[model samples]
Target: TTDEHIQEAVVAAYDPLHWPDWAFDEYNPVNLMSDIMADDLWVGGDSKTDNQPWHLMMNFEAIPTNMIYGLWKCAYSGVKRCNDVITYLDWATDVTDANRAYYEAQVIALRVFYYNWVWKFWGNVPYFDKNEQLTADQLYEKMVTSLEEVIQLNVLPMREDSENYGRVTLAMVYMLYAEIVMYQNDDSRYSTALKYMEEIISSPQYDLMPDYTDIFKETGEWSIESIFEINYKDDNAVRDWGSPLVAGGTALPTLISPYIWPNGTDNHDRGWGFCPVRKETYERYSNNDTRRNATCWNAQAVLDAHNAEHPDKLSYTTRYQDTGFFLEKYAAITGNNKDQKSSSELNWNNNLRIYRYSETLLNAAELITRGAGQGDAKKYLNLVHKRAGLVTEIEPTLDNIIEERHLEFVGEGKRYWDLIRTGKAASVLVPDAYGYRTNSWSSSKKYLPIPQKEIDAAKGTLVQNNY
Candidate 1:
């Protein structure tokens, strides 16, 4: 058992030709979940109680400890799988030198990728390696240091091959490294991330895709701007309500698409109508900003415009907290879930763009602005700004970088963490004028409490995070 079976193990763990269960298990898009928790998207199903845990999360109120159990399990499960893969590789003599280095860097990066969810959300959870309890900062240090080594090794490709689309790559490592470094405010490492960013920028491999709108479409999957993306497909697949985790597509499109979309009503379809984009979020963009219409769909306008021209007078039911805007970035387009073998709702094929070249440019600007190293901060910042069709070029002050991040990565699940990392969460995540969000964010509530069942099972080994 301790001997080598690495060739088979590597395929089982990473090869896209098979299930690659370990890699896909890590695809529980926390970004979509975060959109509900932050100011960008509302839990807009039948009512606030429709998805009650998320409703509480959206308000930053008392979230039940058990609400986030799935995330805990999903992340740690991937961590365990990655650990086993690494061990098998270490023991094996069957692999070639080039393959060994590439595989090692990949699993190591993936291990951090999985544990990061635990660190970012739960903070003080059980660690796989350390027997003693480590503070969130300590865990952050562990992960960042691990990724730092991965970057130095330079084993993973800058991009995955076309068939091996979802595999870990060097670009993903750099992005993840910068993200953790920035979030931790580890200024000592800022210059390193700045250098990484500069390399990414200077490389001919990546650039901003010309049209902002096309970046989210099916046609945009794995585009020039994409550094990394979580892949999904619904063609003759069988992902269903009974077993949602099987290799197939995603439930995101259905979770956020508008409710009961009328037949023949454009190219969109009916969905559960959760995660409506806020009016504030939609209004945040200027009319000329191409990202505005691309990110936020005006459901009311779409319905109105279609009804005005047609004799059928099509109408759809409005769910609770109806903001007349749905998340357009990953909405349910017609035929996306067509000919599914199981429940269509759970079978939409919209690849989650986890990292993009734009983020690399922005990271470079922010690092320079924060005195990491000398560079054209304005040029880096303006690249994203001008791409969004804005005429005004802005300075790369911390504030400007933060606002640009807000606009650029709105529903991609980067805002809440951005706000927290920059010390703006408490002031900005306050009670709303509508009184829906009565609670404001504080450092104490930075990470949600560990699931009570997990604590009970730990039998005092795990110290629960207190809000």
Candidate 2:
């Protein structure tokens, strides 16, 4: 292929249009699937059977049959796409050495991005879909090595230009590195991860948004606080039920939005009514915390307010697991899907904020708190705390940092992994009073079992996870 062809291929592979193909029809953000598995969110629908597999996962009772295979397939597909991109780049003679290396860095980082999901969820899947196996430890090591190579190349920009919002950048690579390093609890890499976070924090290009609530609003796409967001736009989108993988908007907004919401009650739209917020999670935020209202929509209260104003003109059908609270972060905004050429459910243009500067600060604070290296933990922690409308500053103890993370990232699918990595899963993820999560999380349940079909295909070479 020619140089132009190579560039076009790279753009096709890295663009937001390719995102659905990379992680097709899985959870909200294709790579991460913790939305319903944690306490913050419930497998809310018309009873648990509405989405039984997710409910089972929510209860930590997922079996191999019911386990997620879409991610496994999606990730490997991404790996193959990256591999193909790399090979095509190698064949390109018109490209200069400097530019070639730059393209290579992006593809390599993308390859690792795919692997990160496999490493996190399955822990020890077959290597590149071959019979040869790799442990989670080995996978983590491989990912780190490649990411470090990308870092040393220094070819990618720290922040992409506005037009290229979803492409891999130095900041995204560093954030992924820190995320895995911290998750693996590889103490040796702690300092490196901490340094990366600190460097990102010190960079003039990124900082927290002034209003914490605005970070999730429609206007907040690619704001100063966003490090990386999986971009989705409904403008002329073609994604629909018949052909779900077409380039368009994300299905997350409508998937998680409140079902059959009253007309003109608020700016929200109707959705499938899945993943409702727990009452405890809604109440966990303090009355003064701006994030309380920002994160959780009190549907009943909103309707009451509307009814009081409009004299009983508003009402809604409360679905199962309706705690009167719903996830507001990516809730379907009114008319967000109007421009979609097809299915409304698959066309909300809410970009998934995968990495943010707030998390960078939090990661740095946590690393320092855990005795990683030198940094002002208090300063980093307070920046987030104060932004949430809390007046008093807090110390950067490990507990406070953990608690702050819990409060800060409630509905963002970080809670489950945070608990597991911090060794709090067993203690904190115990049976709840609601009897939904009757089972407790243990170390054995850390990684989901390898899907049975994969094991069968491996002819017994694959070792299933204990979970």
Candidate 3:
């Protein structure tokens, strides 16, 4: 039954072009923007400065209208894909009970994942129930579903084979559920969210990777620590291979890592300088935290290299070059040379981790503190800190926990959401002094506006969020 049902489910849910190379195609821009939104990369030369909203959010100038469209497209596309799978499951014949159940779990979990993403970005998003049933009224309703309901219905138990890696697990579902609940102003469901987090922490199915850096390394693709990840492979022969470099034309030496460059451009060709870390972001780390070095590059190193290699070109500001703080965590570039390419078979197959065990520990700590106060929050918080080779232990105060989350999950797309959930986004992120916004970051900014195109398609049926 599983054999017959599983293939149909898999085929239905499969996104042939979810990989990296297909990102820039107009037909596939949603996938491309999603990948960019999830990470930071350095860009310089002739690229558009506002091409990425993640950068704008990091800098604090992101508006609700501008940020909503891409996120809306990405999430809805994913939801549509999951819905297609669910639709196929209904008609699939001679499917095994085990296979059908697993397929059901997969599609449901995927739908939940897309909804959770929308919830994170826009607090009260329109909720859709059945894949086969999409109503005009359902699209217009402002009602929000509780994260508890979504988790209970969607997430499935861990599968036997690890090859089912990217499929959502019950533990991961709970983690997302916990994160959503922790941000709620009401504490009624705090305990419920915490229980799921505790189960994940205590589960035998997952563990922290022994090496902290390994989580971002190419070798860590299917490592024990990864709970859910976007699967990518470098095999050009595979039609579904999700190589980001090949998808975005910039994946060439001129883009991505600052260490590679095109053949003839002599200006110290350490890749394009795209998403450099702010100096203040660098200073936030404690001197002993290993993440500081892991997250940023040194501007001085890039300047020195450029001076020695491209003396003919006029020396420019360190920002124009690698500025030393290129994102080395996710894209590990080794060897030296402006023209050197990353080992294609290695770096090209990089996968982006969506949920991992460390975040689970941190999320549990935050939820426990919000609901029950700081009594045992330190216990969960310290588990992650210790793994990262940072403080041997940390107190469970909100400030310390927030800082820890920042260091732990930087550039992994957790920072902005973490700030928002804690209700600190306005005070923390929006301020001219901080280079985010001169105005206070307001609660109105919490949810992004629904895309205008979506509204237009609805012909005034769907309402956009007001900020």
Clashes of each: 0, 0, 24
Candidate 1, residue 263: CA error in Å?
4.5
**Candidate 3 structure quality by residue, lDDT tens digits, 347-445:** 234466678888877777877777743335788788778776775676888898888877787657677666666767666644444333344557666
Shift of residue 293 alpha carbon in model 3, Å: 1.5
Please list the Cα RMSD from the true structure of every candidate, rounded to 1 decimal place.
Answer: 3.0, 2.1, 5.9
Top TM-score hit: 2
Per-residue lDDT of 65-163 in model 1, one digit per residue for the tens? 525566677777667666777777656765777777777687778878877777888787667742155788889988987897777777788777789
Q: How does residue 345 of candidate 3 score in lDDT?
A: 25
Against the reference, the lDDT scores of all candidates come to 0.78, 0.80, 0.55
Clashing pairs in 1: none
lDDT: the better of candidates 1 and 3: 1
Worst 10 residues of 1 by lDDT: 15-24
TM-score, candidate number 3: 0.76
Per-residue error for 392 in candidate 2, Å, reads 0.5
User: Is 2 or 3 the stronger prediction by TM-score?
Assistant: 2
Structural similarity to truth (TM-score) of each candidate: 0.94, 0.95, 0.76
Over 116-149, each residue of candidate 2 has an lDDT whose tens digit, in order, gives 8778877887666221678989888888999998
